[PDB]
Structure formats: C-alpha cells, structure tokens
Chain A
C-alpha cells in the first residue's frame, strides 16, 4: 500500500470553500491522534466523484499552515503590538466589555414609546464559513444579548435573490441542484463565472452539452467559462435588464411561451387594479420627497371574497400577461443593442436558442450569481430572468429552474439560521415595534380564501412557537416572545443593514463589533470608509484562522497605531477538517462532516468560543445584575453541550426539533422526547420545539439524515440524478422545488424522458412532491399567497416589473428607456458623490474572482501553491484602452475612483473589448478583490478601496459590479 497514507486514519469531509459541496477524504496521522497528512477528493461523492478544483485540492496547505493563529492576542488601545493572552483572560474581558456596553445602550422603549428591548451600540458580522449548528447558536446568543445589527456575507452576496425568487416562486433558494444541470437542453450562464467560481459544476454543464445542450455565456469579459461555451456574447456591466427585457419581448411577440403552463401556473390571468400605471421611468405612487413607492397603487383587483380576479381567456386589458406585453414593447433589438454593446445578430442568436426551450419537453436553465446581484437593480435583474423561465415552462422541471449559485460552503445555511437583521431562523421576520404581541406578529402573515391555494406560510404560528420553545422551553411562546429584541416599524429595513452599520460606525454610534469569520476591512464596499470607521470602536472581537486586515486595521496603510483607541481581541478558530457539523450547499443539501485531526495549537471550534463567552456573560449578570437580564439568564444552552464541549449533534437534534409532551397532530400520535419527523407535525401551542422548521426532517428517529451516504435510486430518480438517499435537503428532501409545475392537471410529466414526479397508481413517484394533494387540485407554488408564478410582483421597492436604470456611477448622462437615469428609490448615503459621465473617471470599473483565490484571500493568500498561481493584484483592460493610455502588457497601473486608489499589474487582452454604447466606445477596467495589504509581500490591496457604499433599495447590497474609474500608467521603480 502507499507509505504516505499507511498508518493514518481516513475520515470524510465537505470542502470549506464554495457551495458546490464537494466531498473530501482526510488522512490523519497515528489513527487520528496526529496532524493531517493528506486531503483529496471523495471518489464516492455523487457531486464531484473525487474531483477537486485547486482550492479544494489545497485544503491540506490551509489546515497544516504554520502562519495559523496559535492562541488569543490582545491589542491595547493606541498599542502597536499584539500581546499573547489566555482564553480565560480574553473571554472574561470580552464578557466585561459586552456587559458594560449592553447596560449603557439598552433601549427598553423607542422614541414613540413602543417596546423594543434591543442593544443599540453593538453589531456582529459573520459568518457563512461556520457549520449550521454554530450559526444557529451564534444568532440566538446575539439576539438574547438584544442585538438587532446582525449581518453576514449574505447581505453583500445573494440578499436580492431571496426577495426576487420569493416574489416570483415563494422561496429564495436555488430551485434545482448541481447534478440536475446535466438534464438541461440550454445552459445560459449570465452574471456568473461558473468554470472559475463553481468549477465542479462544469462537470455537469459539460455532461449537458454531451447529451445535446447548447452552452451560452454572456459576460463583459471572455473568461475560462467562455472558452468552453458554444456561444459567447459580451454585455456591458449594469445592462442586464435591457438584455432580458428584450428576451421577454422576443418571447411574447413570437408566441414562444408555453401557453398551458402560463395560463394555469403563472399569475398571467390575474387582473391588476386601475391604480397601477407606469410613465417615463416611474410606477404609480412615487413620493418624490421621501424616495418611496406607495405599493397599494399596485394591488390586484379583488373579487367579492378577497381573492384576485382571473380572466382565464387572457383578454382583459389589465390581465398581467397583457400589461407585461405592453411594459416590454420598448425593449426592441436596436435599443437593447445600443445600450448593452451587444450586436443585434448576437441578441437574435442567443434569444432564438434560449426561447426554444419554450416547448413543454425542453428545459433551459440560468446559472447566475454576483454579476446580477451586486447592483442597484439586483432584485429586478433576477425578477426579469424568473419571468422568462415561467413564460418558457422551465420552473419545476428537470434541467430548468433558476440556479442562483450560492457562494460560501454554508451561506445557504447561515441565512437559514437568520444571521441577517430582518430574519429569525427559518425566514420568519424579526418583529418590528407594531408587533407588541405574538398575535399581532402572527397576523402580519397574508391569508388566501382560494381553496386551490395552499398558502403554506399560514403555518408560521407553529414555527414561531416551536422556535421560542427551543430557546425558552420553561416559558409560554407568548411570554418568551418579549425576551427577543425588535426593530422600529417606521424605518426602511436598509437602516439595519451592512452599509448603514458602517455609516453609523463612522459617526461614533457603535462601541463594539464582532467580526466573526469575515474580513470587512477588505470585503465591504468603500474599504477606506470601513477602515477609518473601525477606528471609532471602543472594542472589536475578531474570530478567524489568521491575523488579517480586519484584526490589524490599526496598523494598515496610512494608519498610526498610536492615534487609534480600539481594543482588539483576536481569537483563533479551527479549520473545517478539525470539527464535526453540517454545511448546506447551493442545492440545500445539508451534509454532515467529521473531524480528522484535533484542533491545531490552542485554537477552538466557534461553537466552543461562543458558548464559553456567553456563559461568562450569564455569570456576570447572575453576579451583578444590569439591564433586562431575563433573556440571558433563561436561554436554554444546556441542550447545546456534552462532556464540557459544544455538541453539534445535540444542536442539530434541537434544530430538527422534538415533542416536549405526548401529542396528536395530522391525526397521528407521538411520544415525549421523540424527534419531529417533518415540519407538518409542528404545533403553535408549545407541544413542540424546533430551532429551525426547515430542519424538521433532517434528524428524525431514523437517525442523522444529513450523514446518509446512500447512492441508491429508483430508475426514474437515476434518470435525472436526485440521489434522494445522499444526505438531506430542505424542504423534506424536495430536491427540485415547484415540481408540481412539471406535470399537467392529470399528473403526467411535461417531459416524460426527464420526469421529476409522475402520478402512477395512487402515489407521486420520483422526487418528494412539492405540496400534498391529488393532481389538478392545488396551485403548484405552495409558498405563494395566491399559489401562482408571479410575472407581476408588487412587493418590490422599484415596482412589479423590471425596468432598466443605469448604475449610480455610469458612463451615460441619459437613459434611452426613460427620463429616470438611476433607480428612483436606490439606497445612497447623502453627501457621497457619484462619478456620472465624468471625464476624471471615464471607464466602467468592475470586480470579480479567479479560480485560484477565495474571497478577500485572507485564506488563500496564506497558501503558497495558490499565491504561486496568482501572486498579485492585476488589472484586465482591452488593447484599445491600453493604446489610449500608453499601457503595455505587464506595466504597473493606478486604478482610481472618487473613493480611493491602488496599483496593479496590467493584463492587456482581446478578452476585453470596448462597448459601443449609443455610438460611443466605452472602456472597462476589471479588478480581482482577493488582495490585501497584510500578505503576501507585493500582492497589492483590496479593489474595495474603489467601490461605492450605495446599492439595492430592497436589500442594501452594494454596487461592486458597476462603478466608474480612471486607469493611468505608473512610472516608478529600478
């Protein structure tokens, strides 16, 4: 056998980088007692089959890295030095600062005198990089301390996708899964670099092509994805809506929609109120003064029973499908070409190819991510594509869907666990101030009187009650509800989000920050604002693998440590392979992973760090009292622990949930202490606890379903690779969502050759059906109020149809579609100037990734094989732009915006070409944002020195993908 592996124990794990969720084999020396000796792919894993991209293939170099933190370090105010300290010192002092800050900043009641019970002066950032059990424990810890400013990666990543797809379909999640790409007949990759950023996905994309699919990449750059597609079309950054509205128009004009699917399954028939109009950029109900829409102007006309009226002939002028045809009739080839840079020929070619999946037995799929989300119009970009998919019958089918590609390993899961300011675990809203009782909270939920509309959210009362009974089990739901903090009902939700946290930090309003597995000194847009802002904190707790640009902002570029009063605690955490837990992939596959080696040096898993820190805070409250100590004293944390350690297994069981009492539910009978087998059998009365309802099914009486490694399939399941016995996906192992739309009212597949489910005997066969009920008896979209795929979606801040607006910094003074240049209700901070068609910043700036690095490169900048492949910040420009600026391939260049400047090596390439925008060449400058001042030497700093703190009014995601810059040659050096 192999000398290297021989006397080493083998364990299975899941890649700690992207949301594909590839399987690892780990070898640990001396049957598990020594260090990792080897990490490589798990040949048995149904997603990667042993494959790893270079980030997965280098995990050994990350885990066995002698630059890793070894113990806590403390930076005294105005100090230029780290001091080594004990966990006992570090966690007692932090507990002290938490309490001191909580006591001095606690709001029992707001201005208006409503109850809110919230800590104003502490914020938390993180983290999508933690295991699902740690994320849920972490949120509950911070909420029990009264925090409302709780944010992570999701805010600045796929936040717009959740409302965009929820509005369209009922849920915000990726609709299909990685193995399902192979079933597609046309893969459109757009706002995505999937060969670089989801590399194992390309195994399945290429397998689609092997079985007859066309692969289309639409991107402002020619990339490693583009090299391997049949069709490449350029598009200018910030011009997706025109491209997609074009395609809506092309589909409607040429009768390429799936008629039966549109009539029965979309809100096509539903009649909108005479109140709805649209004129020269603005929907009806614009309040100019306050930058806000009166959404009530967009309501459907109700019948007599409070149900939206339907004309199933599609003749009424106020049918959605007729206002759709009217809204997108401006989006003609010549206007789209003129504003995208894309030629008429290329639109025609891509439109003809995609629109052809219209047929019932064809499936087209979109793979999108940050090229669409990181925009002032991000929600509307994703809405426009959701709409196209419904017109073409691609929602619910094998090889269809909206494949919103999630980023980090557990971003799907951290979001599920409510590490965002607007949501508790399971996407139940954070209460605002009007919701003074549980009844007033639960009564927010919209009702349907349509007997065919499941409107499944109506069960929210059960999930809220089970949630409070997981936290506070010796209490009534209604009494425990008062222990949890609330936001103000009069304030835009963007007030509670990433960009406004940093704006408030920059005015002195924050005393403490947890930077828990995030690097906002490099990851946050407008990095110079953030670096100065952190200097206004009294304390900062950085939990991470390595010293970094956040931990050490006080000794960054242009900083004098002696001027900066921030106390910093750096607490070193352990890598993925040194702990047990689950991570949820883009497909909602919740996968269990085991420990290989013991934690390195004095590093600790996050669960243990946060559990220790909370106990010391509870001890301080027991001993001295202070502000509202009840939430802190009463939080059930004894269910989180075993042999004096944090217990991921017992936290998973509690997130799945269990009966506190014997009970009868769904007319079925259950013992006390029994695991809730499904969210169906949860209750509003206190009979059941469940930390996260979406987890009810994950850990039943049959064992840990996330730990299943069973590739067994029926022949129908094998035809489209569901692998329903590999781990567990939410909800209740529904692998393809909205699968009711994949059949006719009989329950026969639209594509028998690629069937998701079929009515055969008296059973649904294939996937778990997405909603109970015989064929034809229910609307297929069970999380929607009205039960339909929304073509018209009136809950969105900018309006119920996508409309093109230029980025807040744009190369045009004038918008060809309307007199509204920018998004009329865009999130912006007064006094922050915007380079609009300014000669000083004449070029489009964009930021993106490479295959070989990860996020801010905090991790991969430490990994010598990945630095070897991509050693330093580069700048991609066309030959045309390089000629204009006298820039030679390999020259040093300085890229600048209103907000900052940095140097980079120029990559002059034909892979970037100028954009003919209204007859004028517009040049683009591309930067990767993986670089930072701390390491390596000569790597460069973060592209976020350039980016603006403005963005989407629905989610506050920054516009990191489209801004304005200059580039000049730099003449320095021997």
Chain B
C-alpha cells in the first residue's frame, strides 16, 4: 500500500499540516491557552488528529536543538489497536487492503476505548467522552483513493512530508537518512519495518516525544 516519509531535518514547525488537517475535515478548534510554549493544542484529542510538539534541547555552542514533531497515527502494518478492538467487536477497526490505512468506524463507541488507546505503542487514539467514539489520523484515505496527496503532505512547504508507494518511500527514507547523518550523527528512522509513517529523527527519538517510537 502507501507510506509517509517524514524528514524532521527540514521541518520549520510552520503548522501548515496541523491547520490543513482541520480544514480538509472541517474539524472544530479546542479552547487553548499559552502556558509558556508555542505548542498548542498541547495534545491530540477527539477533534485534533495532528499537533506539532516543540521540545528545546541543548547543543554545543550558540543556539539550541529545537525539536519539532508533527504527531499522527503511524498506520501500523499489523495494528495492535485492531487486535484489541476485535476482542470486543469486529468492524470497529478495519484495514484498507489497497492503501494500508488503519481506519476507525462508529463501532469504536461499542469497544473499550481506554484499552484501544493503551494497546497503541504510540499512544495515538483519543476518545470523545460524550459519544465514546475514537478518532485519529485516517491517512486522508478518501483523498488517497482518488489519486490526491493527504492534506498535510500537499500543504507542507519544506519537503518534510512525503507520501507514495512503500518501495519509493523506503528508498527515499534510506537516501535521506544517509545525507542527514553527515550533519546529524544520531539520526535514525522510526520503526521503519512496522509503521507506514516513517519519521527521520535528527537525534534520540525520545527527545522529540516519549511515544515517538515503540
């Protein structure tokens, strides 16, 4: 099926992706405040399927390592969320056999939402406390089925976001990993044999986010 390659060595944390995702689905805004960071919303929620995480780390000499992480469902090749959900009710989590998209349906309101979330190694699923429906990135699967890029990939200005067939994206990830490693010796691909959203991190993925990798 399909794959994202997310090269965080090019991300300006412009948040085009965060706003693109809400525009495409006409999602509402959360009520946010500044608690001493550009980061907002502070977390994924029922109505926020992607947010850019901001971490400040040290480096030698002038400046900082400013670490940007646009977080989304990884679309696991073998999704634990689906395994957990199938225990209660099949049809709640399905797989697009053509695109690889892992897709939540309305039947998620019938399963143990907190156990679906806890089965996710990346802590991605979010519950609506009112309806008990789960939500997350759906890979813009309808746009992909009609030959379009996901909203967040088309919007990206820097070449950070990349999408296409698993072979071309794995060949991209490897090429780009070897270049970035020259100027960033700790660069690594996130769980690249296991997920369809492959992040290139410029250092220890845990510095970007505690649930960056499995």
Contact = CB atoms under 8 A, between A and B. Distances in A.
Interface of A: 1-4, 38-41, 43, 48, 50-54, 56-58, 60-61, 195-196, 199-200, 202-203, 206, 222, 224-228, 230, 232-234, 346, 850-852, 864-872, 874, 889-891, 905-911, 913, 938
A102 to B, nearest CB: 46
B126 to A, nearest CB: 15
Given A890-B35, A907-B36, A40 B10 contact: no
Nearest to B183: A230
A40 B149 CA distance: 12
Interface stretch (B77-85, B102-110, B156-164, B205-213): B156-164
A865 B22 contact: yes
A864 B28 contact: yes
Given A40-B23, A54-B14, 5 more contacts: A50-B149, A54-B15, A58-B23, A891-B36, A910-B58
A850 B22 contact: no
B10 A206 contact: yes
A34 to B, nearest CB: 15
A891 B36 CA distance: 8
B18 A869 contact: yes
A61 B23 contact: yes
B20 A890 contact: no
Given A39-B23, A58-B19, A50 B36 contact: no
B121 interface: no
B12 to A, nearest CB: 4
Given A51-B16, A51-B155, A51-B157, A233 B62 contact: yes
Contact of A2 (B15, B142, B156): B142
Contacts of B158: 202-203, 206, 228
B68 interface: yes
Given A224-B12, A868-B32, A910 B154 contact: no
Contact of A222 (B11, B12, B15, B63): B63
Nearest to B13: A224
A200 B16 CA distance: 10
B6 to A, nearest CB: 15
Contacts of B156: 51
Contacts of B151: 40
A868 B36 contact: no
Nearest to A888: B36
B13 A53 contact: no
Interface in B23-41: 23-24, 28-30, 32-38, 40-41
Contact of B155 (A41, A226, A228, A908): A41
A199 B40 contact: no
A206 B63 CA distance: 19
A911 B15 contact: no
Nearest to B65: A227
A30 B66 CA distance: 46
A938 B33 CA distance: 9
B90 interface: no
B148 interface: yes
A908 B36 contact: yes
Contact of A196 (B12, B18, B143): B12
Query: Which are the 3 A-B pairs with shortest beta-carbon distances?
Result: A890-B36, A864-B29, A889-B36
Of B35, B64, B146, chain A has the most CB atoms within 10 Å of the CB of: B64
A864 B41 CA distance: 12
B27 to A, nearest CB: 8
Q: Find the residue from A54, A851, A889 having the highest chain B CB count within 10 A.
A: A54
Q: What is the interface residue range for chain B against chain A?
A: 35 or more
A910 B63 CA distance: 8
Contacts of A227: 12-13, 66, 68
Interface string B37-58: 1101100000000000000101
Contact of B14 (A2, A43, A195): A195
Contacts of B19: 54, 57-58, 865-866, 869
Interface of B: 10-16, 18-20, 22-24, 28-30, 32-38, 40-41, 56, 58, 62-64, 66, 68, 142-143, 146, 148-149, 151, 154-159, 183
A227 to B, nearest CB: 4
10 contacts: A3-B142, A4-B24, A199-B16, A226-B63, A227-B13, A868-B32, A871-B32, A871-B40, A872-B33, A938-B33
A867 B18 CA distance: 13
Contacts of A850: 38
A869 B30 CA distance: 9
Contact of A57 (B20, B38, B56): B20
A911 B55 CA distance: 12
A38 B26 CA distance: 9
Contacts of A224: 12-14, 66
Contact of A870 (B35, B40, B149): B40
A228 B10 contact: yes
A911 B66 contact: yes
A57 B155 contact: yes
Contacts of A199: 12, 14, 16, 157
Interface centre among B22, B149, B157 (most CB of A within 10 A): B157
A911 B37 CA distance: 12
A870 B35 CA distance: 11
A865 B34 contact: no
B64 A40 contact: no
A738 to B, nearest CB: 29
A40 B154 contact: yes
Contacts of B36: 874, 889-891, 905-908
Contact of B12 (A38, A60, A202, A910): A202
Nearest to A58: B19
Nearest to A938: B33
Contacts of A864: 28-29
A37 to B, nearest CB: 9
A41 B151 CA distance: 10
A910 B58 CA distance: 9
Contacts of B35: 890, 905
Contacts of A905: 33-36
A215 to B, nearest CB: 11
B62 A346 contact: yes
Which of the listed residues B13, B19, B64, B149 has the most CB atoms from chain A within 10 Å of its own CB? B19
B23 A868 contact: no
Contacts of B13: 224, 227, 851
A46 to B, nearest CB: 14
A913 B64 CA distance: 11
Nearest to B67: A227
A569 B2 CA distance: 55
Nearest to B58: A910
Contacts of B62: 232-234, 346, 913
Which one of A230, A872, A908 has the greatest number of beta carbons of chain B within 10 Å?
A: A872
A55 to B, nearest CB: 8
Q: Which of A48, A58, A228, A866 has the most CB of B within 10 A?
A: A228
Which of A53, A233, A874, A907 has the most chain B CB atoms closer than 10 A to its own CB? A53
A50 B156 CA distance: 8
Nearest to B22: A865
Given A203-B157, A224-B13, A871 B34 contact: yes
Nearest to A195: B12
Given A200-B157, A867-B29, A53 B148 contact: no
B108 to A, nearest CB: 21
Given A346-B62, A905-B35, A911-B56, A196 B30 contact: no
A721 to B, nearest CB: 16
B179 to A, nearest CB: 9
B23 A57 contact: yes
B56 A909 contact: yes
Contacts of B68: 227
B157 A911 contact: no
Contacts of A938: 33
Contact of B16 (A43, A53, A907): A53
Given A206-B159, A868-B41, A54 B12 contact: no
A794 to B, nearest CB: 38
B151 to A, nearest CB: 7
